[PDB]
Design a protein around this nucleic acid. Structure first.
Ligand code: CA
Ligand code: CA
Ligand code: CA
Ligand code: CA
Ligand code: ZN
Ligand code: ZN
Lengths: 351, 542, 550, 351
DNA sequence: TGGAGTACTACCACTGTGTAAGACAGGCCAGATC
DNA sequence: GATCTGGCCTGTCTTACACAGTGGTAGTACTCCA
DNA sequence: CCAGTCTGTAGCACTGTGTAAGACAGGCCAGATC
DNA sequence: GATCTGGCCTGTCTTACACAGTGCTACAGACTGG
């Protein structure tokens, strides 16, 4: 439960506020970066090395039979657990293109070969979607569920630009929440089906959701309709009957007023909800710990690691989980002249 | 008495603040007045027929994704960003017009001169009033060090030539061709942003609406009350007046000195060493879309560099369509810089000494500046301006420099090289080559060929496989583009860049000062400084 | 109807319009409407040469001492022919100035219109009032530090600059009977930059006595050699005489110390005029005679240097009474009406802080109680007088503090009503005696406060050393000794206090900055010349008159 | 011969381009503080010390029988050989004060009492000059001589201000070479005499002089009249053929053409010259050596230590001699920014 | 019908004399398996 | 312990980035007046 | 004689700029000490 | 005899403020017509 001020020796210009940190097969890969993929690494994804409080960003390289990814900005990430027959995957969907545009594409990323000399090859497949496909959104959440006895994906939330008729060039960069529809996606086939929620009367965004044994928990987030942050957690239960994947939901009584959080996994189903924003200006400093049970969520507040003045005065902050009780947070720095590494970094661990 | 419009012209054409103009007016009225100037509060409404959002208009059919209210004015450049902290912050302060309203204000301002063109051509004025054709040249250039620089980016356009095709049976009749697109006196601003120049994110997230209405206006037509009639208009957009780096950044090519030099042709760098003349101009916007799709989806399961080469350096979905042509001013700067390097090298020796050290080139540059100040009266400069280039391109600079070269063969060689360059230079610099100097354009192919072979023969010590990109552009694309695109130089980004000092001065004597208001009033002035109405009232018959 | 060339020169200078700017709008308005409304550039430049120095012929009888009798000299280099030999003291300091006498006759002939007007009002026969004229002159020398010219890529010391300016205060007549004076012209507001003409500009700091003396020496020699003789001027068609008196007032106390030799700054010798130390200012706070004069200070420096009594170091410094450095310019060290409150303001702030808290029962306070009293006093002022706390007492805060409102508001905390009424009476006498020095002329505006000031300050000091004896044991802030010991003697010796403040140059700092900003030639050797030419053109009474503002 | 970059730990703002360095009874004193004597020091005569390569500056105090000296900038220094009455003494006359004028007052400085606790008390007695007094000037030179066997002093050279007839406030600061006459000063009383010879065709300035056995050698300094630097060394031999001070002079062949030269004594009559300025734009760079005996002056070009680029390239420089072979030089540390310690110090030693 | 005096427009001096990014060549080295 | 290789370094090369606007000076159109 | 109506001038929001009062600190002597 | 810490004195950073201007706005007064 402590922090450590790191330093980005070089490459301290390739991080933007919302970014992704995929943890597969040990090393962490940073995904999404400022600007199009430069030629230092044409594939946009950087292996992250944490050595002596120092931050190294090594280039990665995809397969030949893979596809190439635009560096999505704030997508939804679903850690597709090791199962037959291609472990172990990550589902990225659908994110924000560095060119200011949404993308409804679904990228299935995985590891292919290694090393021979510590080199890590990745592969990335565009997964066509059949439906009833979910329209292009961002900030949403995707999760995996294994129900009796097959694996599916639950997609929900996230904003989107105005519908393509009311979007006026003066209201272009406005954005409203996508319709409150859940989407059940099968990795194969991509027959993505949409489903309503007679209880979720409103969409939302930046809700850090979780899944446990084909039972999903949408933690509270932000709703731009009424500017409210409904702490009421959302439980739901899915049963993939043949061939209709029936769904039910329930409004949990109490949750947490959290927005744009980092979820570091501690146990098999134990997570630290690390921090984000609880108000429009106030940031949630205190940590949180959630155990996922078949009874349900078990919440407790751990000791918040002491915050330096630097991290406390800052207007904003963001980050991503390095896994195994570890994560990385950042602070927009100030000073004269440009550092130009305008982002200070704090590594954080539990226990 | 003085017409109010003239007095507004005098105010903004000399950078006077309301305090200054008010004191001047009070004083000149109290003595021998007989009110001569007009006060502030009457000018502060006497311009409303010059800024955007005064002249009614419409389209047929209506524009997509563009509200049809025609009375809008200065709008915040964010275009309504949900300020919610949780998302990407709505940080950057900007202002702009609505491209359509700007265009209609420009046209209805040129009303006088379009009517003059109607009358001078002896054409009927009441009929043949539905098929006008406008050529609009855009330009968008960054700007640093506007005191950490803060590096604001500016976006401007210019009505280049308005022609008429009515009633048909023909191609068109050039009603009015702008006489001077080079100077900023006709280069009107449309969008100002306090965005750094290279960060794709905020640049796109603010330019998006502009590019959107640009793409939307290409289809329909415009209706304007001009010359008493409700006439019509069609537009064609030339996206030329960018520099090279920005064209690359908004094109999807990996800037800047990549293995793929040409913005228009896909010839690699090494292949631009042996061959220097024969090339084809193929890079187009739609083709770049298709090539980026072929990269992203990767339908052929190729490896990294192989796939890069199948698309020829296209790894970024471009968005702002750019006509395939080179700037004129930066071509001069690039050319000048390269001749300066070659001079620095030939004051010393290179073909006799393979790898000279750093201090040697330092001293060679020093003694070159010595020879160029002792004669020709030229001082050193950190970064090369247009004027220093024009001076470093003339003959007598060569007659002075070549004096230091020991080998008289090299002396005569670079003298003949500069001769070729002066014989071929006014091709792209001209306003209209086929009218100003047709003989250079006629003799440009063979001249370029002889020049390229002279370089490859007497300088192969240096041009083994490295070629600056403007060399390639001026040696392999000039004739094709001049044949196709009518002219060049008449589409220089100069009109933007040299105009930019306005936004410099307009931050001192016309600030507010607060970025919420600073861009607003800077834009207001910088526009009001351009309309031909006011330049007419400024010249007032020579 | 055409426009006079002088009007247009004024309307160019007075609004900082540049040459190219003026010419552009000129050709514009000329080709616009069929007339030569404004005059063009070169004729305006020729017609302006009437106002700059070096145009009117004059004479001086007896002739000046070690001063060239040429009258056509213009803008001279303040170096004064500094030998440029490298081995010697460097000669890079940029500076430009006028020849003092030429500038003076130029400013006088400018005011000639008003002096003739006053002679019309006074009905003095013009063919008779010829020789008995006398002019009072103020001269202020402040160093406007750290200017930013907004185009700096290489340091060329473009920050600090001392601006030696002078101003004609008032001109009177002397002929012919007793008639020791009739004020023919009293400038109406002698503190504003509209009338504060520059004489010498130097691109140096006010710190290094070396360069400052090296470039001011000529000006000092002119000031001296111009005290005795008479100036002959062809004014109003008559060869008339003028005698001068140079009241030099507008220096900051720092510069006054630097030019009277007094050890700077917070020395045991606070007052520049009396010899009393801090303890002798605390014992008796009212009765003091203004004694320090330029000649006496010179003699004191001689006493210190030669040490004719072989007394020890500290005893010698005490016997010379503060004079350790040779003065080099006779200065009239009047009270500076600029601050004139800020020291008094911070003293009343400390007194309130130590009166809400208890200091005259608990003699030795610590940090926490002092800061707590400050906190609660500031909260009280926020509650009642609606004044937020600040770190430094500026002007307006002092002005809004030393008022009976804030005082009767803060009275509610001090428990003993004895001390309440005591400090209220303190502030009462203070704010009654305050406009004696601030306002222009207490001999016309408020003669009652002046006539009462002696007994008023006496009661004030008695109240202090009676009920606040705990704090003025042997230490007193300088401004309090100033306001209690010399105000009547000062206003009696001269006739005012606020009418000789340094306000002129404190304002004209903005003028210098603006002229460097939009009118400079940027050559770093012509720049000063342009700044000086434009600044002088600004402050010529004639041109402000053509700015009638009717 | 070696150079070393020193650093002014404190009291950096009290060194001006001209200054003097005196030695007597060990410690070295610095004379000529810029500005006027502050409250830090009553006198202004600092005591300078090199402690671990750092310049420490302490205050000196004066006795009661002593008079107080104004801070002359470029005085005419003269060390007095240790003998009756007060061995030793130092003659200073008269330089320029912090204000633009000359003292024209000779001062005899010496040490009176010590320590006790490592303190030094000095005395500064004025010695009035009755005559036939040498006019006020600066940059001239004074030296001690012993003529069979009485001790007297010779003064010569130095610029001055234009006489107060053509002294005009348009050229109020233009200086002129004082007429070339040798002035003879006796110390008790100050019965000074003036003398001339046709060999002194012109008056010089900043010419470093060196006396020995009542014979004085004047080097070549600089002249403003002809704007040239006469490399003609000037020998002169005098003796007090009581009661007439008979003098004779001679133009020798060669003297060094450097101006404002530092002189450090190494031996009995041996002085290393670090050199101030050879050419009126290009400063002297080498380091020479002057011996002298009845044979005459013997010059030898010692090895000049390799001047660091910072000192070697900057325009001007100055300094003094710490005695016993060592000396201090200083260069204007002009650049971005001013510390405001604007003079870099270098110690330079012989052998 | 010509003269020169007017006004305009064209010159000159002058700040400082390096940067900030990114692609690629190539050297080479950690460090890790072999 | 030997290889060897992906990854970091260093250097070199290419595309931009600022440096106008202001007074003084003088040719020089050019023209108001007799 | 009066009201519209036009003109002049003051007030507001704003942050870039210089300034000097105050925090402080460290450095040296006095005082107490080794 | 020889050394060290509190007082304080003064040289240094620093930072709260006011002051500068600028466009817009709003009010206040002065002119002119019925
Ligand atoms: Ca550019
Ligand atoms: Ca540019
Ligand atoms: Ca001052
Ligand atoms: Ca001041
Ligand atoms: Zn090409
Ligand atoms: Zn006093």
């Amino acid at each position: 439960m402590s922090l450590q001020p790191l330093t980005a020796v070089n490459c301290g210009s390739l991080v933007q506020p919302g970014f992704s940190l995929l943890d597969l097969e040990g090393d962490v890969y940073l995904f999404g970066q400022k600007g199009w993929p430069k030629r230092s690494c044409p594939t946009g994804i950087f292996g992250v090395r944490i050595k002596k409080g120092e931050l190294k960003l090594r280039a990665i390289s995809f397969s030949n039979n893979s596809s190439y990814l635009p560096p999505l900005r704030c997508p939804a990430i679903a850690h597709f657990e090791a199962q037959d027959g291609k472990p172990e995957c990550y589902l990225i969907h659908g994110g924000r293109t560095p060119n200011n545009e949404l993308s409804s594409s679904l990228y299935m990323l995985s590891v292919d070969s290694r090393g021979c000399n510590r080199k890590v090859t990745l592969r990335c497949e565009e997964k066509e979607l059949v439906g009833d496909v979910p329209s292009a959104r961002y900030g949403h959440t995707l999760s995996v569920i294994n129900s009796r006895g097959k694996t599916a994906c639950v997609l929900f939330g996230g904003r989107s630009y105005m519908p393509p008729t009311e979007r006026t060039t003066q209201n272009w960069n406005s954005v409203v929440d996508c319709p409150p529809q859940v989407y059940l996606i099968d990795l194969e086939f991509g027959c993505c089906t949409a489903h309503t929620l007679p209880e979720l009367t409103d969409g939302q965004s930046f809700h850090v959701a979780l899944a446990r044994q084909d039972c999903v928990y949408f933690l509270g987030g932000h709703i731009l309709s009424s500017d409210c942050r409904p702490s009421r957690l959302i439980r739901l239960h899915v049963e993939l009957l043949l061939g209709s994947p029936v769904l039910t939901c329930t409004i949990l009584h109490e949750g947490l007023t959290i927005t744009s959080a980092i979820a570091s996994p501690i146990g098999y189903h134990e997570y630290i909800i690390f921090g984000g924003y609880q108000s429009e200006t106030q940031k949630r400093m205190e940590c949180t710990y959630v155990g996922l049970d078949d009874v349900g969520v078990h919440m407790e507040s751990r000791e918040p690691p002491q915050w330096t003045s630097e991290i406390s005065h800052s207007r904003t902050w963001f980050g991503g989980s390095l896994g195994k009780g570890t994560a990385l947070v950042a602070i927009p720095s100030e000073g004269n002249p440009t550092p130009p590494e305008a982002y200070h970094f704090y590594q954080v661990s539990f226990q | 008495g003085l017409h109010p419009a003239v007095c507004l012209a005098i105010r903004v054409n000399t950078f006077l603040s309301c305090s200054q103009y008010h004191k001047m007016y009070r004083t000149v009225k109290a003595t021998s007045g007989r009110q001569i100037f007009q006060p502030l509060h009457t000018l502060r409404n006497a311009e409303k027929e010059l800024l955007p959002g005064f002249h009614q208009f419409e389209w047929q059919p209506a524009l997509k994704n563009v509200s049809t209210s025609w009375d809008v004015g200065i709008i915040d450049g964010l275009s309504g960003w949900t300020v919610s902290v949780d998302d990407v912050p709505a940080d950057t302060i900007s202002r702009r017009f609505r491209y359509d309203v700007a265009l209609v204000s420009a046209l209805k301002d040129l009303e006088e001169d379009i009517m003059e063109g109607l009358r001078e051509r002896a054409l009927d004025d009441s009929m043949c009033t539905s098929g006008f054709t406008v050529v609009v040249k855009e330009s968008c250039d960054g700007m640093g060090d506007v005191s950490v620089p803060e590096k604001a980016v500016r976006f401007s356009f210019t009505i280049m030539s308005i022609s008429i095709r009515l009633e048909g049976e023909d191609d068109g009749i050039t009603i009015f061709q702008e006489q001077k697109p080079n100077s900023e006196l006709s280069c009107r601003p449309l969008c100002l942003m306090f965005v750094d120049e290279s960060d794709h994110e905020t640049l796109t997230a603010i330019l998006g609406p502009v590019v959107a209405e640009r793409k939307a206006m290409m289809e329909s037509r415009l209706i304007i009350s001009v010359g008493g009639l409700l006439r019509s208009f069609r537009f064609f957009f030339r996206g030329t007046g960018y520099d090279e780096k920005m064209v690359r950044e908004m094109e999807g090519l990996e800037a800047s000195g990549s293995t793929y030099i040409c913005t228009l042709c896909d010839s690699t760098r090494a292949e631009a060493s042996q061959n220097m003349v024969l090339h084809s101009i193929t890079r187009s916007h739609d083709e770049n879309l298709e090539r980026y799709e072929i990269w992203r989806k990767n339908p052929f399961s190729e490896s990294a560099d192989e796939l890069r080469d199948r698309v020829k350096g296209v790894s970024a979905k471009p968005f702002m369509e750019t006509q395939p042509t080179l700037d004129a001013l930066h071509c001069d700067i690039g050319n000048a810089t390269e001749f300066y390097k070659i001079f620095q090298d030939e004051i010393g020796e290179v073909y006799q000494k393979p790898n000279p050290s750093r201090e040697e080139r330092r001293r060679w540059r020093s003694t070159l500046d010595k020879q160029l100040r002792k004669k020709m009266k030229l001082k050193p400069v950190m970064r090369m301006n247009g004027n220093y280039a024009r001076r470093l391109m003339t003959r007598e600079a060569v007659e002075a420099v070549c004096e230091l070269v020991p080998s008289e063969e090299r002396r005569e060689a670079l003298l003949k090289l500069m001769d070729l360059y002066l014989q071929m230079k006014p091709v792209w610099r001209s306003t209209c080559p086929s009218r100003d100097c047709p003989d250079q354009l006629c003799q440009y192919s063979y001249n370029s060929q002889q020049f390229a072979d002279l370089l490859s023969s007497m300088f192969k010590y240096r041009y083994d496989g490295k070629i600056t990109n403007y060399l390639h552009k001026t040696l392999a694309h000039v004739p094709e583009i001049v044949e196709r695109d009518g002219s060049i130089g008449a589409w220089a980004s100069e009109g933007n860049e040299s105009g930019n000092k306005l936004f410099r001065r307009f931050r001192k004597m016309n600030a507010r000062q607060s970025k919420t208001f600073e861009l607003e009033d800077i834009l207001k002035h910088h526009w009001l400084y351009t309309s031909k109405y006011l330049q007419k009232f400024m010249e007032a018959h020579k």
